[PDB]
Design a protein around this ligand. Sequence first.
Ligand SMILES: O=c1[nH]cnc2cc3nc(NCCN4CCOCC4)[nH]c3cc12
Ligand SMILES: O=c1[nH]cnc2cc3nc(NCCN4CCOCC4)[nH]c3cc12
Ligand SMILES: [Zn+2]
Ligand SMILES: [Zn+2]
Lengths: 364, 364
Amino acid sequence: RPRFSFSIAAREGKARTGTIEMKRGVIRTPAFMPVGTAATVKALKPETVRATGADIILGNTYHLMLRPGAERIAKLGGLHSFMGWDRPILTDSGGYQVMSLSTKQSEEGVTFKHMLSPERSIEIQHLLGSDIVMAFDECTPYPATPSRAASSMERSMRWAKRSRDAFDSRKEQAENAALFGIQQGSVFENLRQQSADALAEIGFDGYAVGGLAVGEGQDEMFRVLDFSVPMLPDDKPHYLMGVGKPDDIVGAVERGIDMFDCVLPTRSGRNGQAFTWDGPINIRNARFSEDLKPLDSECHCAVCQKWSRAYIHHLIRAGEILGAMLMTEHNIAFYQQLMQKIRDSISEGRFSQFAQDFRARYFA
Amino acid sequence: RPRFSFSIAAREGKARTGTIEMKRGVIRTPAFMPVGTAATVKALKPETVRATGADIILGNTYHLMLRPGAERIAKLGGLHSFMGWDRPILTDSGGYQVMSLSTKQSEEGVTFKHMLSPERSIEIQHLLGSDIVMAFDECTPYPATPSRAASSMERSMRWAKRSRDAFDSRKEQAENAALFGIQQGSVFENLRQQSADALAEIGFDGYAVGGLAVGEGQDEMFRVLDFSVPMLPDDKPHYLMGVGKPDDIVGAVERGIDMFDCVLPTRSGRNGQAFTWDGPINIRNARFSEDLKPLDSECHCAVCQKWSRAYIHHLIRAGEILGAMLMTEHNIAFYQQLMQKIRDSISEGRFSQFAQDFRARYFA
Ligand SMILES: O=c1[nH]cnc2cc3nc(NCCN4CCOCC4)[nH]c3cc12
Ligand SMILES: O=c1[nH]cnc2cc3nc(NCCN4CCOCC4)[nH]c3cc12
Ligand SMILES: [Zn+2]
Ligand SMILES: [Zn+2]
């Protein structure tokens, strides 16, 4: 019923658990968003994505704005109808992948081989029918000089204001969707503070920590999160973009993050990597050829209820589509079970113990 | 409950409809068997294969005997457990693909780059836990001289007797599975008769028409079926190997065939060809880019209940796994709906009219 309502039900240290209520559904936080690259979570029907426990998916905009195109998807009834996912979708701005997959940069926006600006990005996300819209920003490369990081962040803040204005100008979008801003500033505490101040001044429904998971490594990422997350408004969701491995997620939650997206469970799945409570395994390895156990001994997913490591080993080695399907369903389910354990442990005031127990076993 | 019981419930001309009862399930005839190439019906979970209406699948033996190997599959609990399909499986002998995918031929069997003989084939199928076992034969190439066809057929008949003996020697196989013989003789009526006589003398649970769908074309295939099928025992199932397109199936049923297998619905599915009552379409074609209709307007499958041509067009053009999944599920469901319409129309004594109506619309 509500457009966007974030409620925090429980806390432990910097960690929070709660819910975001939106018109298309409730999102339990901390949340993991499976990534839909070109209007599909690779190798999964939407009903299967939901069966794993996902409340919301991320829709990449960059590919969709090229093919089939945002106007075409709108003509076909919007992204939800098009792909058959009726729950919330968070769309990215399209700019991150422009820089990584295409470019000419200016104050207006980015030209690439088309022009993408804050205004055009917001309109594209509107045409897709996004529930959570990301402001159009610039992900500062790493490493960056303080001066380069500063000028980059400042441009992102101007683009954040333009994103806000474009979103607010579209009545139907403002009434039915939410808008998140993205903090920049590289690894520099003062710039992160200036960025947080600028975003709070403008005002958003949620705040992402941008500019991380770009090669800096976990120690440095955690160091930056240590000071950066407390700068954001406490009463709104905190979203860490493009993170990450299970241990990255646990540590980020310990530091105040409420939302995550990553291609790892899907991409790894197709490549033969399965996540387990005892760490990742490569199912192609010969040691699994006669292993009748499920991928993970505790996992509640449909794959682990029915098929053996030996069978999935065979499928992946044979290049069979079903191999990709089963690995992906399991990995996404594993990620959702991780999030559920995180939510329950915070709710119960035993998250610290969970984090310690998780790491001891995962890295044994 | 029974090992193998074929009952004919209704007839119209040469067409029959009925059931084969086996320990793992009932098979409604005329039946279409989706093909499982390497212990998977490509891009489908077994539950989805069943949801389309399939009563039985065909398991290719050739690939499995190489990897993971028949002894390994037996150690892992058999093919049914391995792949998660608990209903009947018909296994081929492995010899057809040896000739088409690998060879040295002799009276003992075939050597290839391993030796495959009637005895080894039967043992492999036993290790897999097959419900319907195919005799090991030789598919005569087309065209063939009468003398070459004759010597080839005669060798197949000797191999059929050896297959029978090997099957009967394995108590557990003889008690729980069925054995089909394969008629040869190329396009020659006298040789087809000699082959049928030899097979009936030995005695099988079912009889396949071999040596067809090997380049002869539909007119010639139908011509050979016209005289060949009546030579087989009327009271046992008739199985046409490797057929075929929807119109091939309808015409073969008109000529007395009860069982079919073909890679077309699965293989075509992955390649972008969808079967419809108005003929096949290629979903990649630009004309489908904004088409909100389902693949077929009447189809009862889950794919046609939920997704548009436009979406599947997008998926297939993007090389997305979900595209292969949806196309394959629809095509297999379409084939099963065809078989259901065939069964109902024969039961109701209106199959002739159905065949005419089907062809008029399919080829309009
Ligand atoms: O500042 C950002 N602004 C807008 N989008 C982003 C997306 C981002 N994605 C990553 N990292 C992705 C890490 N992946 C891990 C798996 O393999 C692919 C890379 N960092 C990101 C930062 C930003
Ligand atoms: O005498 C036979 N003996 C044992 N196995 C067979 C398998 C057979 N498979 C075909 N034809 C297959 C036709 N396919 C159509 C679809 O594209 C691939 C070929 N004909 C066949 C004949 C025999
Ligand atoms: Zn699992
Ligand atoms: Zn359909």
